[PDB]
Each structure stands twice: as structure tokens, then as C-alpha cells.
Structure 1
Amino acid sequence: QFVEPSRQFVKDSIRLVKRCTKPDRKEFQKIAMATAIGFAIMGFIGFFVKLIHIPINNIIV
């Protein structure tokens, strides 16, 4: 009894994806640059904090 609802959902999703505004190469590059910058910020701040605190944790503990 779920065949018809599944087919209807597939059709609706296909029509939505066809009607969505897919990113182009300029938008993709802008979002990729922003994500890379944010990832670099958070990840490298955490990385350097961990490096700093490894000897500190060794000394105190």
C-alpha cells in the first residue's frame, strides 16, 4: 500500500530538485572559501591549543 506514496514522494522530490536553484561555480567557490576559512580557524586554533597544552598537562600531571 506504500507503493503509491513512495512514487508520489519520488516525483515531488524530483520536481523540487529540478526547480531548485543549484549553485553555480561562483557561488560554490564563495561558499567553499568561507567554509575553508571557518574550518581552518576552528581546527587550527584547537590544534595549536592542544599542542600547547600537551606539555602543560605533562608538567602538571
Structure 2
Amino acid sequence: FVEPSRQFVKDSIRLVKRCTKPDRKEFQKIAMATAIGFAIMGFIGFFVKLIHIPINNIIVGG
């Protein structure tokens, strides 16, 4: 029991020291890039809803 785990952990503790790992210049890429999607999506997802609430019974003004 558990003897494989002490080798699993040691084998998996390798690839973390081996891996590249980012630093802020790449950390900033992905941070900036999060802002990109955000700004394009919204607009429509708000147009969609305004058409339907005042057609069945007027309660907003659209």
C-alpha cells in the first residue's frame, strides 16, 4: 500500500523543475489578453434580452 505514491510524487516533482514556467512579460500577455474577449462579448448579450420583456407585457420601454 502507498509504495507507488512515494515514487509518483518524486517522478512528478521532476517535471515542475524541468518545465519552462513563465515570468511577468508572458504573465502580462495572458493578463492583457483576458481584457480582449471581455470587450467584444457583452454588447449583443444585452441587445438579446431587451426585445422580449416588453413584447409580452410592457414593463421597461424597449
Q: Deviations over 1:17-58 (max 9, x none)?
A: 111110110001011111221234334543454456555675
Aligned to 2:58: 59
For structure 2, list consecutive stretches of 5 or more residues without a partner in the other structure.
Answer: none
Q: Percent identity?
A: 100
Which structure has more RCO (C-alpha within 8 Å, separation ≥ 6)?
Answer: 2
Aligned to 2:26: 27
Q: How many residues align?
A: 60
- Alignment RMSD (CA, Å): 3.4
- Point out the structure with max Rg over C-alpha: 2
Matched, 1:17 2:8: no
Q: TM-score under structure 2 normalisation?
A: 0.61
